[PDB]
């Protein structure tokens, strides 16, 4: 037992092929194996697919392939506005009372105050105010907080 | 040799049962004549029938389908006896 020459750092005792890969027998004189008919077509077509997918995913401008990428700057701007507005809301208790009235008519709980602030420009609020479902007080409240 | 489905019954008994279909065969014209005649009269009468509920019609169709006997069935079982 032990190592072959007693030293761990000695040349391996096996010379040859550990196994036959794909079951192919090495040519005696070292002649290369003839390539299969499909190898070139397969490699070109699939490599072209994967490379095209890579280039489209990364090369394309924002919002062409991934729609969320386009929305990121706009979300930052709305985040800034919302943050300023919420800060103003916390300070002024008169506005809070008016919104508590607006919320009740809209079948919303008091905690959903921040939610109303965050939906200033959304299908439900925009079309409800026009149609009459949403009380017109909300428009003034939003303007008081710089829209 | 391969696995095969088991056939219920003995060979000679099954063949004997099959041989009960080998009987004098009437011509189909005799049946057709009566069916054509009565069918024509039936179509004439049907115009005067009262309007029946869809449920009753469907039930009548079911009963007729259940009570219909295939021509082969009578042929195999027919016996010229009392």
């Amino acid at each position: 037992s032990g190592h072959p020459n007693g030293s761990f750092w000695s040349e391996g005792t096996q010379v040859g092929l550990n196994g036959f890969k794909y079951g192919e027998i090495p040519l005696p004189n070292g002649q290369p194996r003839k390539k299969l008919w499909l190898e070139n077509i397969w490699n070109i077509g699939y490599g072209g697919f994967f490379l095209g997918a890579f280039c489209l995913y990364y090369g394309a401008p924002p919002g062409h392939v991934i729609p969320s990428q386009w929305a990121t700057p706009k979300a930052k701007d709305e985040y800034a506005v919302d943050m300023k507005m919420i800060d103003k809301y916390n300070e002024r208790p008169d506005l809070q009372a008016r919104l508590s009235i607006v919320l009740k008519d809209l079948n919303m709980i008091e905690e959903e105050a921040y939610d109303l602030i965050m939906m200033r420009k959304d299908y439900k609020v925009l079309l409800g105010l026009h149609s009459g479902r949403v009380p017109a007080d909300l428009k003034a409240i939003y303007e008081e907080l710089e829209a | 040799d391969e696995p095969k489905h088991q056939i219920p019954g003995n060979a000679l008994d099954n063949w004997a049962f099959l041989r009960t279909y080998a009987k004098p065969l009437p011509d189909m014209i005799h049946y057709y004549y009566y069916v054509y005649l009565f069918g024509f009269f039936f179509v004439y009468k049907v115009a005067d029938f009262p309007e029946y509920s869809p449920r009753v019609l469907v039930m009548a169709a079911l009963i007729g389908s259940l009570f219909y006997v295939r021509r082969d069935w009578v042929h195999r079982e027919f016996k010229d006896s009392p």
Partner: protein
């Protein structure tokens, strides 16, 4: 609220005019509208142009909401990581805002069968407050816990 056929055809003609005005100048952001087409239709499907434009506006808005929620989550995570053990007191507000954003994004277009997403247990807490008020005023005994000051890091 009733809509007469005369008014319906009038709105249809106005919608056609809006389409014609949009068609006059090319816009690469035609399907990312910043404003909806306001209407009082019983069904949006009646006016196809309004339906498609408003749907595109709703998609734009929802994408914006999703990105806003991701931004809110990033500030909450930074705030939580900076404060240390004082996170519970100092990060109540940021968390409140993040949870509000999550509710707005999920609830706006939940779907016909989806339930409201109660981020922060606000609805449950409200229900428990109402149940407590009723039990106390009517002299009943409540089998439910009383409402909580804080149920989550924020809401």
């Amino acid at each position: 609220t009733t809509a007469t056929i005369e008014e319906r055809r009038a709105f249809h003609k106005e919608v056609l005019d809006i389409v014609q005005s949009k068609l006059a100048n090319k816009n690469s952001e035609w399907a990312r509208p910043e404003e909806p087409i306001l209407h009082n239709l019983k069904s949006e499907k009646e006016e196809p142009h309004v339906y498609y434009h408003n749907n595109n506006f709703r998609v734009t808005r929802q994408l914006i909401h999703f990105e806003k929620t991701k931004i809110f989550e990033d500030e909450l995570d930074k705030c939580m990581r900076t404060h240390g053990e004082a996170k519970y007191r100092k990060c109540q507000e940021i968390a409140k805002r993040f949870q509000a954003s999550c509710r707005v994004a999920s609830n706006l277009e939940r779907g016909p069968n989806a339930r409201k997403r109660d981020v922060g247990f606000i609805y449950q807490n409200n229900k428990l407050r109402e149940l407590e008020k009723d039990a106390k005023e009517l002299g009943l005994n409540n089998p439910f816990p009383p409402s909580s000051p804080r149920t989550t890091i924020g809401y």
